[PDB]
C-alpha cells in the first residue's frame, strides 16, 4: 500500500515497507510567462515541483495548498500523476493508498480529495488519517498531546489511552508561510529586498539555514544592539553576500505572541496550555511531560528548551514537564502513516471500491 | 466458603479462615464516552472498580447499587465474575457462599440476588445474613445495639442476650453519599466547583482526608470566623492547590440535625435514643453502655466522644453510657462474617441447591 | 430606587418607576492594540460596550464577567460607571440600588460587589436578589419553578406558595458563550473561518437571527441532507454571502443532550425532571404546569414545543404539563425588579450604610 504525505509545503510518498519515504519535493507547479524563441522541447507547458525548483526565474510558481485546503484541484491531481507515474514509477490501479489531512478541514475537501484518489486514478482502497494521531504512531506512545507546525497550518491534539478529545483540538494558522513573509518584510530593514516567487525561495533556504530560537529574546535582542559579533554571512546564488543579525531570532520568536504579526490570537505555548485546560481534571499529569513536537517548523534549534521555560512559568508548580522534541520530526507523520498501513488489524478500515459504489463520495462520513 | 460484603459502595470479599479481607475495591463500572481514535486492545467494553479507579476521566462511573438496593443487576453480575474469577482466582461451584445485606430491603432483592449467586455461578451453598447481626460476631457480645453506617444506608438493630426486635429497627437513608454531594454543594462556597463522576472521586477522597467531628459546633463555627488559623490545604492531581475552612467539620456535622439537608426526620443521635426507647423497660440498662459503631462513616474522628455526649445530654441519667469503637470498623461486618462462616453449628444452616430446586428463590423467607 | 441587572452578558438598567429598562448595552470593555500614527483625542484607553461595539476591529473584546462570576473588578467598576454617569445621568448617592446574582456564587463575590456599590458610588442602601425569584414577580405566581438561561449560567429555584427549596436548586454552566463557540465550531464545516473577538459577534448575531429550535432533530437531520431547500443566506458586513444549513438546528440543540460539547451532565429537560423529583411528592402536581422559562438564551423558537414534549415523555403520565413562555423574557428579571424595589413592604430590606458600618460587607449575610 501506498502512504503519501500530501501535507502542505511539500509532498513526502512511498511504501508502508519502509522506515522512510522514496520522494520529497516540494509541491510546486510552474509555468513560464515567456514564448519559446528558439525550437525545441525545451519550454514545457507546465513543469512540477521536481523540476520547476530548479527553472524558476523563467517561471512563476503557485502552490495547490494553502492553509492546508487545496485551492485548486488539477494541480494536485498533476502532483498525484508525477507521484505516481513518474517519481515511483508505480500504477495507483495496483496499491491501497492512505492520504493525511489537517484535523478540521472543509468536508468537501475529502470528498473531492477521494473521488479523485479512485474515479480517475482508480486505486482499490482508501483512507483518511489525520496527521497528528499518525505522530504517535510514529512515537509509539499511547498517551500524549501532538503538536504539529508545517507550512501554514499549526494544530494540537490530545491524545489519552489512545482515544481524542474532540473538543479539546484547536488550530492556529501561523506557521511556515505566514512566518517567511515575516522574514522577507523584516528583511528590507537592512535594504535587501525580495518581490517575486522564485526569488522568495531564496528566503525560505535562508530561514531554513540561518534560524535560532532565543531562550531570552529580551537579552538576545540586548547582545545584537551591543557590540556583540552575532551576525552570519550567506551567499546568494549570484554571490551577493548578505549579512544577517538582529533578525535570525527575532523572525521564529514570532511563532511565540504573533502580535508581531497583528494576529489577535494567543500563541503556540499559550495554545498548549489552553488545550490541556481543556481536558479532564486527572489528564493533566499525563498530557504534561508527554509533549511531542513534529512537522518542520519546529525544527529550529533551541525551541525545546524555550517551550518547557515557557510552560513550565505558566503551569502550576510541582509537576513534571518534558517535551518529546526526537530528530526525524519532519518524516514523523509519514513513519506513522507507514505503521498504521502495515498493522494487520487495521486492514478492515479501508474504504474499499464497493462501499463508495452504494455511497458516493460521502461515504468518508 | 467465601465471605463476600456486597455492601454498597465497595466491595469486601474474602475466605473465612482469615481475619480481614483479600479484596477491597469500589465496586465501580465505568464505561468510556469517546470513538477509538487509535488502534489496540486497550479499551474493554467495561471496567471494575480495579481499573475503572485509575482510568477515571476517559469513563463515565455508574454504581449498581444506590440508597443499598441494587439498581442494575448486569453490572453486579459482572462485579461478583470479578471477584469469583479475577480477584480471587476461585471456582465458585467449589465453595459456599454467605451474602450480607441491610436489614430492611425490598424481597424480591433476596430473590434476585440468590438465583443468581447459584443458578449462574451454580454455588453449591448460599446464605444471606443482615450485617448488623454480623457485626456483634465481630464484637463478640450478646447483648448489645448495633448502628451501621455505610455508603447510602444507616440502620440500627437492638439485641439482647442474642435476640433482635424487630419491632425497634429502623433505616436511616442519610450516610455517606448522600454526604458527599453535599460536601460537593458546600465547597462551591469558596469557588471551585466539582460537576462530574470521575471529578468527584476527588471530593470523597478530600472528605477522607480533611474531616473531623466537633464537639462544641457552635463554638468551632465561632473559632473559624475568628482569626484561627484552621484551615488545611489539599492538592488537587493536576497540582491546583485547595485550601478549606469551615467547612472541615460542617460536613460531617450533617450527620447531625439533618435539616442541612432538607431532610426532615431525626438525625443519628435522635434515632438512637427512639430506637432504645422501644425496647422493653429493663433492656435500656443493657443497650446503654453496649452502644457498637459500625461501617465507614462513623470512621471520622471526635465522632465517639460527641455522640456520648449526645446521648447523654438526653437519656436520663444516673445511667452509665459507653460507646463501643474499636478501630477496624471498616472491616467489622465482614469479620463476624467470617466468624458465623467458621462455626460448625452453623453449618445446617445454609440453603442447599436440593432446596432451591423445591422452592426457587423465594426458599430465602 | 434604581435596578441594575448586572447579569452576565449584557447590563440592563433602569429606574423601578418603569415597564422596561432605559439601558441595554452588552458590557464589553475593550481596548486599542495599534499605537497613535494621528493626532487626536479618538484613542481613549478604555471604552464601554455602547461604542466599543462599533469600534470593534480595532478593539479586543474582554467581558468583566464569565460563567456568572466577576473575572476584574475594576472593569465592573467601570461599567457600573457609565451606567450611572454617563448612560442613565443619575448621581448614585441620591438612590438606591439593587442588584442580581445567579443563585450560588462565590461568597466573596456578594461582598466586594456591595463594597463597591457603597463604598465607591456611596449609594445609601444596597441590596441583592437571585434572578429566578424575581421572575416569578414578573409573572406575578406565587407557585412555580423557574428556569433561567443566559449568558453561560443556567440554573433552577423551585418555588411553592412563595417558598423555595434550597436543596432542590441546580446550576448548570451550559448556556450561551459556550454554545456560541460551538456555532464557531460547527461553521468551520462550511469553510468560513472566524478566529477573533470582534469577529465573533459576527458569529453571536448570526445565531441571534438564523436560528431555530427542531422538535424532532433526527427528522430535521434526514430532511436537511435531502434535496430539501432548508439554507438561509447572511450577508457578512464586507458583504460576503453566508449560506447556513444542516445548522441553524444543530448548534441550539447542544443545548440538550449536551454530549455534543463533551459537557458529560445531564441537559436541560433532564435537569428540570431532577429538579421537581427533589421536591416533595405532593409538590409535584403544582410545579408541573407552572415551568416559567426566562432568560435570553430561551428566545430560540420552538423551544418551548420541544421541552413540553421532552417532559411529556418523561414525566408520570395523567399529569397536565404546561410551559410558560412568555414574551418579553428578555426583561422579565429586570421587570421583577422593578416590582420588588416598588413594593413598600420591602423597604425595610435594604442594607443601609448605619448597618454596614457596624458590620462591614459580610452583612450582606
Ligand atoms: N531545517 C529547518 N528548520 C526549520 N524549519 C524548516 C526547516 N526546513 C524546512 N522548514 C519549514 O518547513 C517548510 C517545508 O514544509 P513543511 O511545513 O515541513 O511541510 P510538512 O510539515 O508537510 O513536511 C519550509 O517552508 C519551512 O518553513
Ligand atoms: N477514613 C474514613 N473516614 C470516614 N469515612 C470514610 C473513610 N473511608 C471511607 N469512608 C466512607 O465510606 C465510604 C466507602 O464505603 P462504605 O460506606 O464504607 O461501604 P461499606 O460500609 O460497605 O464498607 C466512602 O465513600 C466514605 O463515604
Ligand atoms: N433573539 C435571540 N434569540 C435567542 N437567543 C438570544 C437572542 N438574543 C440574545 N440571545 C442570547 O442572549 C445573550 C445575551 O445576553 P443574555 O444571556 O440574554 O443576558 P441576560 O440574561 O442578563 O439578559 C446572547 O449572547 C445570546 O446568546
Known sequence: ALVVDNGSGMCKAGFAGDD????????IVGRPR???????????????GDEAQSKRGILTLKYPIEHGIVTNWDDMEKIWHHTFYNELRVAPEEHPVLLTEAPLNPKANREKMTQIMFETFNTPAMYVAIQAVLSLYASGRTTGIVMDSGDGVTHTVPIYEGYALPHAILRLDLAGRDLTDYLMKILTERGYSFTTTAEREIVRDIKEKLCYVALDFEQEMATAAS???????????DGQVITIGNERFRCPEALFQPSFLGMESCGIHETTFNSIMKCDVDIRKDLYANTV????TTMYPGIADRMQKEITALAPSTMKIKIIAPPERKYSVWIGGSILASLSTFQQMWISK??????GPSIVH
Open 20 to 27: 522512510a519515504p522514496r520522494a520529497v519535493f516540494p509541491s
Open 293 to 296: 513536537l513534529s512537522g518542520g
Open 227 to 237: 557590540s556583540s559579533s552575532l551576525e552570519k554571512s550567506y551567499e546568494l546564488p
Open 34 to 48: 515567456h514564448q519559446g524563441v528558439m525550437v525545441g522541447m525545451g519550454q514545457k507547458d507546465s513543469y512540477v
Open 354 to 359: 464497493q462501499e463508495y459504489d452504494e455511497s
